[PDB]
Every structure is written in C-alpha cells, then in structure tokens.
Design a protein around this ligand. Sequence first.
Ligand SMILES: CC(C)CCC[C@@H](C)[C@H]1CC[C@H]2[C@@H]3CC=C4C[C@@H](OC(=O)CCC(=O)O)CC[C@]4(C)[C@H]3CC[C@]12C
Ligand SMILES: CC(C)CCC[C@@H](C)[C@H]1CC[C@H]2[C@@H]3CC=C4C[C@@H](OC(=O)CCC(=O)O)CC[C@]4(C)[C@H]3CC[C@]12C
Ligand SMILES: CC(C)CCC[C@@H](C)[C@H]1CC[C@H]2[C@@H]3CC=C4C[C@@H](OC(=O)CCC(=O)O)CC[C@]4(C)[C@H]3CC[C@]12C
Ligand SMILES: CC(C)CCC[C@@H](C)[C@H]1CC[C@H]2[C@@H]3CC=C4C[C@@H](OC(=O)CCC(=O)O)CC[C@]4(C)[C@H]3CC[C@]12C
Ligand SMILES: CC(C)CCC[C@@H](C)[C@H]1CC[C@H]2[C@@H]3CC=C4C[C@@H](OC(=O)CCC(=O)O)CC[C@]4(C)[C@H]3CC[C@]12C
Ligand SMILES: CC(=O)[C@H]1CC[C@H]2[C@@H]3CC=C4C[C@@H](OS(=O)(=O)O)CC[C@]4(C)[C@H]3CC[C@]12C
Ligand SMILES: CC(=O)[C@H]1CC[C@H]2[C@@H]3CC=C4C[C@@H](OS(=O)(=O)O)CC[C@]4(C)[C@H]3CC[C@]12C
Ligand SMILES: CC(=O)[C@H]1CC[C@H]2[C@@H]3CC=C4C[C@@H](OS(=O)(=O)O)CC[C@]4(C)[C@H]3CC[C@]12C
Ligand SMILES: CC(=O)[C@H]1CC[C@H]2[C@@H]3CC=C4C[C@@H](OS(=O)(=O)O)CC[C@]4(C)[C@H]3CC[C@]12C
Ligand SMILES: CC(=O)[C@H]1CC[C@H]2[C@@H]3CC=C4C[C@@H](OS(=O)(=O)O)CC[C@]4(C)[C@H]3CC[C@]12C
Ligand SMILES: [Cl-]
Ligand SMILES: [Cl-]
Ligand SMILES: [Cl-]
Ligand SMILES: [Cl-]
Ligand SMILES: [Cl-]
Lengths: 312, 312, 312, 312, 312
Amino acid sequence: VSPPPPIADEPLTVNTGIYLIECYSLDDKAETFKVNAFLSLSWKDRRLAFDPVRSGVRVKTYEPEAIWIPEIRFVNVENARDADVVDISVSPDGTVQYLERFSARVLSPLDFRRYPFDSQTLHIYLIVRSVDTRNIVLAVDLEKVGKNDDVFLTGWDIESFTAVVKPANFALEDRLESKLDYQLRISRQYGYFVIQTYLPCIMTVILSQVSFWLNRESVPARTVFVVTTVLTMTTLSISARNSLPKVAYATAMDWFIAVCYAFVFSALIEFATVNYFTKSQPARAAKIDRLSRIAFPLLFGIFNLVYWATYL
Amino acid sequence: VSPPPPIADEPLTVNTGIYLIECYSLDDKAETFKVNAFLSLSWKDRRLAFDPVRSGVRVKTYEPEAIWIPEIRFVNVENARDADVVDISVSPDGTVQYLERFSARVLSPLDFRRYPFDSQTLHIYLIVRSVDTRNIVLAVDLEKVGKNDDVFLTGWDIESFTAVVKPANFALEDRLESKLDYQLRISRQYGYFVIQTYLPCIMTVILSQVSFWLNRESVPARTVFVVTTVLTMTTLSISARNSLPKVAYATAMDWFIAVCYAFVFSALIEFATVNYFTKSQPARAAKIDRLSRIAFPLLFGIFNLVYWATYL
Amino acid sequence: VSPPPPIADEPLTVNTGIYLIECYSLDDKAETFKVNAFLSLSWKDRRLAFDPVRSGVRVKTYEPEAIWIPEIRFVNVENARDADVVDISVSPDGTVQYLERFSARVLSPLDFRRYPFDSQTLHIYLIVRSVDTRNIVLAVDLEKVGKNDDVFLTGWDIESFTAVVKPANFALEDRLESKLDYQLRISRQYGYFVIQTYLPCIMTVILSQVSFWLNRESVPARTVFVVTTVLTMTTLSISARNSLPKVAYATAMDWFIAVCYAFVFSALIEFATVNYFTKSQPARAAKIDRLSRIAFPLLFGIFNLVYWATYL
Amino acid sequence: VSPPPPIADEPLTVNTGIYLIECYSLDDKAETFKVNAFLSLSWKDRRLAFDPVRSGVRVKTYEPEAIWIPEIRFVNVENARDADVVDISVSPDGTVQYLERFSARVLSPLDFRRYPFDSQTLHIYLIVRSVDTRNIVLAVDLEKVGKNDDVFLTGWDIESFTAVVKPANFALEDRLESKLDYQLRISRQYGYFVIQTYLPCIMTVILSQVSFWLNRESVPARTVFVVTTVLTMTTLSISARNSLPKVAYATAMDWFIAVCYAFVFSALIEFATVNYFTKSQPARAAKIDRLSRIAFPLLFGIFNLVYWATYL
Amino acid sequence: VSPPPPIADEPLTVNTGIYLIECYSLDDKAETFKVNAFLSLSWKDRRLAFDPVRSGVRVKTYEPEAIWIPEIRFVNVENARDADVVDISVSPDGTVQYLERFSARVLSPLDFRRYPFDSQTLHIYLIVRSVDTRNIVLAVDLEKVGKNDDVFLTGWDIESFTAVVKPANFALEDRLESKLDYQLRISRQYGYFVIQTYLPCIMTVILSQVSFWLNRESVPARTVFVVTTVLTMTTLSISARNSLPKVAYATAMDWFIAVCYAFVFSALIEFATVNYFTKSQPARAAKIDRLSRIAFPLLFGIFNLVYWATYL
Ligand SMILES: CC(C)CCC[C@@H](C)[C@H]1CC[C@H]2[C@@H]3CC=C4C[C@@H](OC(=O)CCC(=O)O)CC[C@]4(C)[C@H]3CC[C@]12C
Ligand SMILES: CC(C)CCC[C@@H](C)[C@H]1CC[C@H]2[C@@H]3CC=C4C[C@@H](OC(=O)CCC(=O)O)CC[C@]4(C)[C@H]3CC[C@]12C
Ligand SMILES: CC(C)CCC[C@@H](C)[C@H]1CC[C@H]2[C@@H]3CC=C4C[C@@H](OC(=O)CCC(=O)O)CC[C@]4(C)[C@H]3CC[C@]12C
Ligand SMILES: CC(C)CCC[C@@H](C)[C@H]1CC[C@H]2[C@@H]3CC=C4C[C@@H](OC(=O)CCC(=O)O)CC[C@]4(C)[C@H]3CC[C@]12C
Ligand SMILES: CC(C)CCC[C@@H](C)[C@H]1CC[C@H]2[C@@H]3CC=C4C[C@@H](OC(=O)CCC(=O)O)CC[C@]4(C)[C@H]3CC[C@]12C
Ligand SMILES: CC(=O)[C@H]1CC[C@H]2[C@@H]3CC=C4C[C@@H](OS(=O)(=O)O)CC[C@]4(C)[C@H]3CC[C@]12C
Ligand SMILES: CC(=O)[C@H]1CC[C@H]2[C@@H]3CC=C4C[C@@H](OS(=O)(=O)O)CC[C@]4(C)[C@H]3CC[C@]12C
Ligand SMILES: CC(=O)[C@H]1CC[C@H]2[C@@H]3CC=C4C[C@@H](OS(=O)(=O)O)CC[C@]4(C)[C@H]3CC[C@]12C
Ligand SMILES: CC(=O)[C@H]1CC[C@H]2[C@@H]3CC=C4C[C@@H](OS(=O)(=O)O)CC[C@]4(C)[C@H]3CC[C@]12C
Ligand SMILES: CC(=O)[C@H]1CC[C@H]2[C@@H]3CC=C4C[C@@H](OS(=O)(=O)O)CC[C@]4(C)[C@H]3CC[C@]12C
Ligand SMILES: [Cl-]
Ligand SMILES: [Cl-]
Ligand SMILES: [Cl-]
Ligand SMILES: [Cl-]
Ligand SMILES: [Cl-]
C-alpha cells in the first residue's frame, strides 16, 4: 500500500503522543535508560472514510497489514524498539488513530558537572522520513502525552515529561525528515552519596586532624595517622570516579574529594614540618601544632558551610 | 475477527488466573524478579456455542488464530512476556477457556527500610484495554490461582501468592482499562548477612576495645588498633551499602553499622584523650581506661540487646 | 491436527530420552546450568500406519506441520528451549520416532552444606499436559538416554545421567500432567579452593603464631602481626562467602574459616594478656608465651587432622 | 530472482553510502564499538523500467521480496546486522535506490601504544560477492556519506567519517569479492585518566619523598612511608593495566607508572642505605638525605616536563 | 524433499570447508571463543543434473527450500549457529556447491598447565546424521579451507587452521554419525602477565630481602617489611588465580608465585629467628643476616634462571 493522496499539495501531519508506563535502568556509566510506554499516532487517510449512516458502525477497525501506516522511528536508540500494536481505529471522515505499546533502550547523554546534585533532561527523538508522493510532518497531541503515576527511577525525582511542539524538519539524503523532541526531566537524589562518599571523606579529614593532638615525640603513631588518611583519600577518590563515564570535566563530588585531599595532605606536610623542628626549636613545633588544632577544623567547617550552602 | 457481541449492554468479564511454575532471579539492586507461570483466561463468546448432539464432540478446541482472544498485557514488565499457548477449549454454551505458559521479567519496587529483616510484596499487574465495540473487565478465578510447591527464592521465604478480586478500572487515552493486582509476599532470610556484615562489625568493635587493655606507654600499638578498626568500619559500611539500590533512606543494617562506627570512633577519641593526659595527670588517664574497659562492652551489649530484640 | 484416537480407553504413552551433547555454564550463584542435548520422543498414531509391501518404502518421514506431535515442555527451565527438529520417522504400524536437538538454561537448586566437598543432583523435569481427547503419559526409553564422552563441567566430575522410570502424574488446573525426572549427578573438584582459600587461612594462622616467638618487649611488632592476621581472616571470610548464593546455612569452608578465625583471635587475646602481664609478673607472661608456642600449633594440627580426615 | 542481465559484459556497481546516526559502546577491552546508521545502495536493473505516463507513478516503490537486491554484508562485525528496510524507489530507467537503517557491533582493533593519548581509526568493511551470472562491484556515493551532528563517543573526540573510494576486489573460494573501507577517526580524551591514575602516581611519588625530611633516627616512620608508597605504586600499576586488553606492548601510561615506580623504589633503596650508614658515618647519611631532598623532586620535575611536553 | 538416491549402494560424502573471517572473544574462564566464517559444502544429487546445451545457463542456482540439503551441525557449540546462505550453484552433472556465512560460540576446553606459556588447540566439530534412505559421510575440500590474513586473537598468536581429513564415524541412537575436526592452534602471548603478575612478585621478593639490611634492633621496621610482603604475595596469588577457570591442577604461574611465597615466608622465618637470637647470642643473629644477604638473592637469581630458561 502507499500513503494517502493529498487533498491539494499539503503535508501529512501525524499527531504523536507517548505515555510512559514503566521507566527503569537509568545507567549513569552507559548514559542509557530503558522505557516502556504507549505510542499513539493519528493522521487522515480519506481513502478509508465511510458513511456513518449507511455503515451502521461508528469506528471500524483495521489490521496493520490492511491500511497504510507511517514508518515512525526513534533516533537516539540502540536497537529498533519492540512494539506490539494495541489498536487501530479509523474515523468516518478517515482519521486513523493508531496505538501501540513499545519498549526501548534510549541513549541520552548526561551532564555530571553538578553531580551528584545534578538534574538531567533525557531526550527521546521521534522522526519520520518523507515519501516521494508526499511530505510527512510530525505533530504533538498533548492529550496523548503523559506518564503513569507509579513511574519511578530509583535514586531520582521525576520532574516532568513534555514534548517540544515545533518539530525539526530538515533535508537528509534528498528527502525531508521530521523530528520531535520528547523530554523527561529528572533531578538526582544525592542522599545516597552523602553516606556513600561524603561521610568517609569528612571522617577521614577528622581522623587526620586527630594526629595533631598526639605527642610530638611519638612519631610512628602520627605517621600511621597521616599516611593511612592520605591513602584512604586516594582510594575514596578513585572509587568515587569509578561510578561515572569517562567524562573529561570534574563533578561537584570531585571538588569535595579534592578539597578533603588538600586538607589531609596539608596535615601530612604539617606533620613533616613539626617532626623536622622537634629536636631543634621545640617552641616552633609546639606553636605549629597548637595553631593547627584550631585552624584545620575551622577552615574545614567553613568549607563545608560554603559547599553545602551552595549545592543545596 | 472482533469481540463477541454483548447479549444486551453488559461488559465482557475475563476470568483470569496465574499459577507460578518457576520463580527466580530476584534482584535487589534492579528491583526486578523473573517469573514463569501459567496464565488462564475464561470468557463467554456465544458465537462459539454449538449443539453437543449434532456435533459428536463434547468440547472442541480451536487455534489462537481461529477465534477472538482478549489482549491481556502485564504492566510492570520490562519487555512483552514470552508466552506459548497451551490449550483453547470452548464449551457448548460458548465458554472459552484459554491457557498459556509465559515467562517475564517483572519490575516491582522494594522497601529496604527494614532490610535485611524486610518483607516484600512483589506485584504482577494484569491489564486489558476495552475496544470500541464493548468494554472488557477483568476478574479472578480463585480455582486458577496458586503456585507449585517447588517454587523457591534462594534467599527468601515465600509467604503467599494471592490476587485482589476487585479490579482497578480507569480512563487512559480515551479508553477504559481494567487492572488486576497479583501479590507475591516474601520475607528475606537474614542469616546470610549475620555472617556477611554483622559479625565483622561486632568483632571490629571488640577488637577496637582490646586496645584499652594495652599499656598506655606503647602508643604505636594502640594507634594501629584504633586506626585499623576505624578504616575497617568505613570499608564494611561502603561494602554493605553496595548491595542495595541507590535508595535515599537508611536500612536497619545502616543503623547497626552506624552505631558500630560510633563505638569505634569513640574508642579513637578515647585513645587521643588518654594519650593527651598520659604525661601530665597519669591518674586521670588511668581512670579513663579503667572506666572505658567496663562501659564500652556494656553499652555495646545493651545496644545489641535492644537492636536484635527489636528486629527479630 | 489432533491427538491419535485411543484404540479403546487407554492412555497414550510417549517414550522419551535425552542424550547430553554439551554441558556448560554451571553457575553456583545462579543455581543454573546450560545443557545442549538430544530429545527423542516415540508414540503410536495408528492413523499413520501403512502397508510395508504395497508401499515400497520402509519408513516414510514427515514434517512437524504434517502430523500431530505432543507438546512436551521442560519445567525447571528459565525460557522455552531452543530446539531444531532433527528427524521424524513413522513405522509401518504407526510408531512415530521424533528427534530434536535442544539447548536450555536449567534452574536446579544446589545444597552447599558440604561445600566445597559437595555433590549435586541436577534435575531436568520433562512434562506433558493431557488433551481433552486423550490422556498423555510419559515414559523413559533407556536406549535413548545417555551423554557424550567429551562432556565436561570445568571444576566438576560428572558421575552419571539417568532417569527415574516411574513418572509423577498429577492433576493441574483440571487437566492431567505427567512429569519425568532426569538426574545428572556430579561431584565438585575441591583442589581449586585448597590453594584459593584453605592455604591463605592456614598460612594466616601460622603467621599469627609466629608472634609468640617475638620478644614480649617489642609490642608494636606483635601488634602488627595480630592485627594484620585478624583483618586477613575477615577479608578471606567475606571474600570466600561471596562465591555462593545467599544461603541461610553454613558450609564446610565456613566452619574451617571459623576455626581459623578462632585461632587468630585467640592469638590476639593472648598478645593482649601477655602485654598486660609484662611489667608486673613477667614470669606469668613468659609462661604464657612458652605454653602457647606448643599448644596453638598442636591444637591446630589436630584440628586439620580431624577436618581433612572427616571431609575426605 | 536473479541479478539483472549485463547490458554487454560489464560489472554491476552498487553505489553505497553510510550515514552515522548513533555511535556508542566503544569498548577498549573488547576492541569493539556499536554503530547505528543508514545504509544506502543504488544500482541499475533495466528489467524494472516502466513508463512514467502509462504508469501514473513517477517512482513507485517495491518490497524487498519483490525485486533482486544485492547481498551486501559487513566483514568486521560479530553477528549479522539487524536492519529495517526504510525505502526502495525505482526510476523509469530502472535505477533502484535502496535505503535501510541498521545497527551492528563492529570489531576493529585498537593501537594502545600511545594510550591514553591515542587516536584510532575504526573500520567498517562492506563486501559483496559476485554471482556466476555477473560480477558485482561496490562504489561510494559521497552524497550519501556522513554522520549526524549529535553523534558522540562519551570518552572521545570524533574527527571525521569518510570512505575509501577505490574498493578492494579479490578472489575468494573461486568467486570475486568487492570490499569497501569506511573509516571513523577519533582521538581519546585523556583528562579522565589524569585524575584517575596520573594524580595518584604523582602524589604517591611526592608522599614517598616526604620521608627524606623525617629524622633519620625515627626508622618506623620512614619504613611506613616507603613501604606504603611502593605497594601503592604496584596496585596503581596493576589496576591501570586492568582497563586494557591483553596487549603485548606497553602504553604511555605504562611508561609513566614505570618511572614513578623507579622513583619510589629508589626512595626505598635510599632509606635502606641511610639506615645502614646512620650509626657509623652519620655524616654520610646526612649527606645522602641532604642531596636526595634536592635531586629526587628535581629529576621528577624534569621527567614530568619531558613526558607531558612530549605526549601533548 | 528427500536425499538423493544412491547410484548403487554407496555412501553420500559431503565435501566441507571452513574459511575463518572473524575470530574474537576467546574467554579463558569460560573456555569458549566466538567464530565467524564461511561454511562450504559440496555433494552430488544426480536428480538435479541437466543438459548444458539445451539449458542456455552454465550453472543454474536454487533456493534452500527447492533441493535437498544435508543437515550439518556443530557439536562443541553452545547454541545453534546463526547462518546466512550466501550462494547455491549446481553443476551440469549435479554437483551442488553450497556456501553460507555463519557465526557461532564454540566451546573448547583449554589446558592451563603451562599457562601463561601455554599453546592451545581449539576444536570446531562438524557432524552429520545419516538418514534412513542413505548414509551420509563428511569430507574435507582443502581448496575451501583457510583463514583471512587479518584474523587476530588479541592475546594470542594464531599458528594454523587445518582439518583432519579422515572423519570420525560412529553409531548414535541407531543411526550413523560423521564428525569432522577443524583445529585452530594458538600460542598465548605471555608478556602481558610478566608485568601483570611476575614483576609484582619479583619486586615483592626483593622488597622482602631489603629487610636483611636493616638494623637488627629496629624490630618494628623489619616487621612491617616482612608482614606487608607476605600479605602482598598472598594477594598476588589469589588475584592471579582469579583469571582462570576452576581447574584442579596448577599452572606455571602458580609455581612461580609459590616459590616467591616460599622466599618471602623464608624471610619471615629468618626475621623471627634473628629477633629470637638478638639479645642472647648476638653473634648468631649477625651471622644469620650476613649469610642471608648473600644466599637469598643468589638462590632467587638461580631460580629465575632455571624458570625462565625452562618456559621459554
Ligand atoms: C602549607 C604551606 C607551607 C605549603 C603548602 C603547599 C601545598 C598546599 C601544595 C603542595 C602540593 C599541592 C598538591 C598537588 C596535588 C594535589 C592533588 C589534588 O587531589 C586530587 O587528587 C583530586 C582527586 C579528585 O578530584 O577526585 C588536590 C590538590 C593537591 C592536593 C595540591 C594542593 C596544594 C598542595 C598540597
Ligand atoms: C563537644 C566537643 C567538645 C567534642 C565533639 C566530639 C564529636 C566531634 C565526636 C563525638 C561523637 C562522634 C560521632 C560518633 C558517631 C558518628 C556516626 C557516623 O555515622 C556513620 O558512620 C554512618 C555510617 C553508615 O551510614 O553506614 C558519623 C560520625 C559520627 C556522628 C561521629 C562524629 C564525631 C563525633 C560527633
Ligand atoms: C575474654 C577472656 C577472659 C576470655 C576469652 C573469650 C574469647 C575466647 C571469646 C570472646 C569473643 C569470642 C568470639 C566472638 C565471635 C566469634 C565469631 C565466630 O564466627 C566467625 O568468626 C565467622 C566465621 C565464618 O562464619 O566464616 C567464631 C568464634 C568467635 C571468633 C568467638 C570466639 C571466642 C571469643 C574470641
Ligand atoms: C643506584 C645503584 C647504586 C643501586 C641500584 C639498586 C636498585 C635501586 C635497583 C636494583 C634492581 C632495580 C629494579 C629492577 C627492575 C625494575 C622494574 C621496573 O619495572 C616497572 O616498575 C614497570 C611498571 C609498569 O610497567 O607499570 C621498575 C624499576 C625496577 C624496580 C628497578 C629499579 C632499580 C633497582 C631496584
Ligand atoms: C622447622 C619448623 C620447626 C619451624 C619452621 C617451619 C616452617 C618453615 C614450615 C612450616 C609450614 C611450611 C609451609 C607449608 C606450605 C607452604 C606453601 C608454599 O606456597 C604456597 O603453597 C602458596 C600457594 C601458591 O603458591 O599458590 C610455600 C612454602 C610454604 C609456605 C611452607 C614453607 C615452610 C613452612 C612455613
Ligand atoms: C589549611 C592551611 O593551609 C592553613 C590552616 C592553618 C595554617 C597554619 C597555622 C599556623 C602555622 C604556624 C606558622 O609558624 S610560625 O610560628 O613560623 O609562624 C607556620 C604556618 C602554619 C603552619 C600555618 C600554615 C597554613 C595552614 C596549615
Ligand atoms: C557510644 C558512646 O558514645 C559511649 C560508649 C562508652 C561511653 C564512654 C564510657 C566511659 C567514659 C569515661 C568518662 O570519664 S572521663 O574521665 O573520660 O570523663 C567520660 C565519658 C566516657 C568517655 C563515655 C562517653 C560515651 C561513650 C563513648
Ligand atoms: C584454641 C584454644 O582455645 C586454646 C589454644 C591454646 C590454649 C591456651 C594455652 C595456654 C594458656 C595459658 C594458661 O595460663 S595461666 O597460667 O593463666 O593458667 C591459661 C590457659 C591458656 C590461655 C590456654 C587457653 C585455651 C587455648 C587458647
Ligand atoms: C634518581 C637517582 O637514582 C639519583 C637521584 C639522587 C641520587 C643520589 C644522590 C646522592 C647520593 C649520595 C652518594 O654518597 S657518597 O657520599 O658516597 O658519594 C651516593 C650516591 C647517591 C645515593 C645518589 C644515587 C643516585 C640518586 C638516588
Ligand atoms: C631459602 C632457604 O631456606 C635457605 C637460603 C639460605 C639459608 C640460610 C643460610 C644461613 C643460615 C645460617 C645458619 O646459622 S648457624 O650459625 O646456626 O649455622 C642457620 C641456617 C641459615 C639461617 C640458613 C637457613 C635456610 C636458608 C634461609
Ligand atoms: Cl525504533
Ligand atoms: Cl506483557
Ligand atoms: Cl522447553
Ligand atoms: Cl552484516
Ligand atoms: Cl549448529
């Protein structure tokens, strides 16, 4: 079969709508998420029109093989979606209403700069390619767009699911392409990380500062403190970066871990300095420890104040 | 083909039933589990009635392609289930009895607040969408609901598998939808975790208390004890939280590990205090150790008493 | 097509047989294994009989779509098997011999109580559901049961592949079901674990005992020994249990690791005691070390004797 | 159907083109990447010519099963691509223009010698096998080659996507084969590794040098420093090499880690030497530390200068 | 359709040949590898002969459904291969030449005794089952066997790809089976492991020997050295064995790691002995250190000489 003829020289618009049923498997490392939703299309094929009075039927349903149906494709997807046609109902005037349920693995990049205080805008791009008989354009039926109430992305807050009404039509390989942009905005729930990374870092800084209260003569103890806290800092750094894709930039968590490492390494340099001035000039070492015991936790407290105040 | 005509203006009810055959792959992190069971439907299509005398057959079986069959779908599923039709038998009055065997990956959220002493209610949602010719409603055939005796969840105890008789009918994209809620209740077997996390934590607290009995002059020894116990606590915490999804709340295990970390870090602060009072005021330090050796294991024992008494 | 008519009122028996061709991917954690074997069925459909003299052919082969074939299904399998029909040959009397080659992921629970000295009985459950025209029963053709010589389960010794002749017939959803039990018995090869887990534990106990021979005055050294051996014990314990499913009970390896941890922690308590009696009553501490140096390795040797003697 | 007849004795050329739509899952360890793009073919089958006036259509489109289509296969692919035919348009002269959208897992080796400062040229090899009736040759339609602007490799910069016009024709199993070479050039974004590995190594070298400023009499402290830095170096080496395939050569990161290990182990040998000359010849040890404190960081700075200057 | 009739009473031989196109994903742990190659068959079905003069065609091509084709199966494969028929050309005398392109996951056991200096012989087993009308036997057409030059196993050197000409015929379930053995011999590239495991082990032995040059009075330092090197050895052992399947035997790497562990633990026993003889009989301890400093690195050098000389 072939596309319906134009009543003049006008483009055929397909009213689209997506209703999210299930939303799962948001992969930060793969920058993909799995979706299972309704796809609804609606166009006008006057060849299928009929008299509502002579025909005692009010709708009349067809099978996908019976009538022409537009080839609608997703762009930012890994494999072609798995779709099951739910219903096809033509109107007495020829208005075809098509409804399927599909599942797909969507590939949408994420911006981890404000991670884990980041919000994302996942994109689902519909697209249709014009035929030689007629140009096809996509539209948005807001009545057919939405998401179920029990849709959940564990670890995220789902903000909204909308669509950009004005489609992007463009030339591609000598044919017209019409693209729609469905947008799922979310905001990450950072609490999980506060006890996953932020607490080990803060407690490691505190543990490193405890060394300033040990006697300056007991070198091995303070050495254990400093060294173990520095290595612990490095381990937390790598471990934390192992959850993200190979992004080139640095996240907010990256900055917090970096400042913590600065404090711990500062405690190391301090321990080395004091140990260097212990035999000769014991007054200097005593002053260094005495001042550090007040400055370190103070600067650290101010830092946490500015940080959590900023990212919350 | 199209749905059977209403004998007046009455909804077509489809009597459903699920019989769990196999139950496996309950993923705590993905909050999904794989199910393999029987799906049984039963309705009345008077068009299929027949004379039991003229027709020498008492039942008569059809092929799925021959007669109208309702489109029954699962909601909380990742992909459309894989089903093999087992049998289709019509009654002389037109009562179609349909039986298939399906396997599906069900997506059901979990509540880890009482983890690992938690009980869960896995949900399997049936749903059918009404056609324009007639509304379809779902029902539950208690005779067709159940589960095999050899159904096992390697880490769980299976409590029961029932279904909510009253379906949830609602409007979706201008059509009526009927949803049924099958519930599989389970309770986790916590023993695995007692030796996976709880024992390492308790033994780390005890090991941390062993430092109080070492001579106050041998500083490096007590330093090794305290530091290693604190780092061990941090590692056990992270490792333990790595088994769950990025939930925002805290589990019971989270509380136990948190209190253990409180005891260990308290032992650290104690070591720092005593080391600070060792040269000047040795009597004070001696009092500190003497009291700690009795308070720490006592408060810890009381805590374990309240905790294990509460969560069991 | 429909099932062959009963020559009176007798059940139709299908002679079954499985020939293991390939056996791989035995997953201890998933309690599943992958199989690839021959499935052979044989029944009597007198409608297919023919004259061996008038018909110059001795066998005559059909296509699956041509004749009725019983719907045979596996029970303890995750998805429907992937089968390729190999041959279908009818006899002059109507004896259909059907042969396919299938691969399936079988789900069979394991008993890790004697792990890693455990033996298992993997189960493959065949089943057939009776039709309304005739009851179908399963049988076992010992001539068609077996396994290839080059079948290997890396890390296991394959003992036998047999079948329980008497099938389990029972009522299910108002129809008769016939179940057969094929059993693949295997015994694990424990050597891999002796150098994977048992050696690290034994060597850790020895290393812990080495501290008793260090001078009682060098406290930090003995502290390092004891602490590192205890942490090593915990790490080996958790690491070892990470290979099994979340079973509630304890394995033999669990017992060995537990006794090792008891010896190491006992060495810790000993170090604390001696360090506590070093200044006052040095004779007591000296006696403690002197006795431990002989008692610890002796009790440990006896333990290994009873253990390896028992589980070997 | 069979290939179109040659208008004389000429090979049939198929004008090919790939338009990258999606590019993802570039696996360094598997040396594979997943691609999703348009494949466009174009040939001349005069048997399909038609009158544009008698036939009221100006192009008129067919189904894949209707007309002869050349068997085009990818070479460096793991499984046969999953393709959905988008359009087939014939011209009045018989010019078939074919368009599909495919996804495939391409297998292209990588050169990690300059890793992570490496650039790669991923290859996609098309091929067609000539039939006995006519030889088939592949060509490149530059109008049909390109890639979408929103194509992204989460860890790479995409340089260009071109194709080698002149195909490689050769004999294979007594038939002619024509191969085309599409090339996607990329350059890795190394920043991720600077904070993933390079910083831990640099900070570990610095931390190892901090030991030279500790008193020569406090042996245990310097021991802790040296040992922990050496073990940290080894762990970072192994961990770093765990990201690449089992390549036989050494990467640039391998060289950086190797020099760092040389500096750290050199600090170990230095500590051993000084500790050996501390009691006898204290002036010598003092000279050793005094010189090392200036030589080590200087040679390290020069090394970093030459290295980062070279690889950037 | 049915097999071609025998011109007398002779077996039908099918000339087979495999041409490796792609070879990848050699999994040492799973003992499987993925292959993608050409499969070429050639037999004689006299029913298809034709006159080359009356028929104006020189070859004439058929569809798989048109003519009888032998059921060729792989044995040591996990799932049935995915094959796409490339060409079918019959000769005027009836010689059918069949060509497909397949991909399959081959399962072949490996011998890790000489690992990582091991060479393997991967097996691909063809097999055909004789029908009741005629016995079928497999043969090898050397013209159709080979492999592309750009075939690579990222961690191996590919030696050759040949086939055993004489097939293995045997009885199976009352029918004749013919099996062919294609052999791909390879030799592992061990360099990756020299810097992955061998270097950490050697440097850890050296690090353990460094303790002999430290003063006998600084007990804690030597304790740190010995303990850390022993634990490092154990970790390298387990980590190394984690790359192989649960084999019961020991590899060459296993032996090297074992000897290294013997040297390190010997250094531990030495430190304990000297520490035991430090106060009383200091001359004995001094002699122990003096001799060890020369014997240990010498015995280690001799060992490395014999080892690397043997396995290379
Ligand atoms: C106190 C006065 C007398 C001298 C202080 C000099 C230091 C403050 C300088 C010398 C080395 C510098 C460090 C060089 C490297 C790093 C590593 C970097 O840490 C990380 O690895 C980040 C990890 C991550 O982001 O996940 C943070 C900055 C820091 C500590 C620098 C902070 C500033 C340091 C410690
Ligand atoms: C009032 C001045 C003079 C003394 C202040 C001392 C405090 C800074 C110390 C005493 C008790 C310590 C607390 C003891 C226990 C913990 C629980 C710990 O929580 C966890 O580790 C959670 C782990 C998990 O969630 O798995 C966070 C640090 C904290 C609050 C410690 C932070 C440091 C505290 C508050
Ligand atoms: C305090 C003095 C006066 C008497 C000595 C008492 C000790 C012999 C007790 C105190 C704590 C007890 C320990 C408490 C808990 C356990 C854990 C238990 O299980 C495990 O270690 C886990 C092993 C596994 O499951 O794989 C082994 C015995 C052990 C170490 C106990 C051994 C006996 C211990 C050391
Ligand atoms: C300077 C003179 C007076 C005494 C030299 C004694 C040591 C400093 C020498 C003896 C053995 C040498 C080692 C022999 C082999 C190597 C392996 C080499 O390989 C790597 O670390 C590669 C790391 C990677 O591939 O990622 C690093 C240098 C090192 C340790 C050498 C460093 C210098 C060592 C320790
Ligand atoms: C002479 C007696 C009175 C006191 C000293 C005895 C030790 C020197 C003996 C007792 C146990 C023996 C150990 C038994 C087993 C092994 C394991 C072996 O290495 C391994 O098996 C590690 C596993 C691997 O290589 O994969 C190295 C020698 C060693 C430590 C032996 C070294 C010699 C040991 C320590
Ligand atoms: C995190 C930082 O970067 C700060 C926070 C507190 C600061 C320290 C406070 C007190 C002193 C004592 C002084 O000794 S003196 O008698 O020679 O003047 C030398 C400088 C020193 C060690 C400061 C160095 C910088 C800090 C570590
Ligand atoms: C989990 C907790 O937080 C508890 C567990 C055990 C408790 C300690 C038991 C004994 C003492 C000695 C007493 O005397 S003093 O001369 O140091 O002031 C001061 C209080 C102090 C340090 C308790 C503080 C609170 C704990 C750390
Ligand atoms: C695994 C075990 O449970 C055994 C292994 C070795 C045993 C110890 C050997 C030596 C002594 C010294 C003796 O000292 S006394 O003068 O106070 O009586 C008290 C008893 C004590 C601590 C034994 C207790 C039990 C063991 C810890
Ligand atoms: C990267 C390297 O490998 C260099 C960097 C600094 C160098 C050291 C500087 C000073 C001295 C003191 C001298 O002692 S002496 O009084 O006997 O001459 C002996 C040589 C020694 C240990 C050098 C050895 C080589 C280095 C470790
Ligand atoms: C790898 C090994 O196992 C060997 C390699 C070198 C050997 C050592 C060489 C020298 C001596 C001195 C001698 O002292 S004595 O005055 O009592 O005789 C006692 C024995 C002792 C410690 C040897 C023990 C065994 C070794 C550690
Ligand atoms: Cl799609
Ligand atoms: Cl479904
Ligand atoms: Cl099955
Ligand atoms: Cl392909
Ligand atoms: Cl196959």
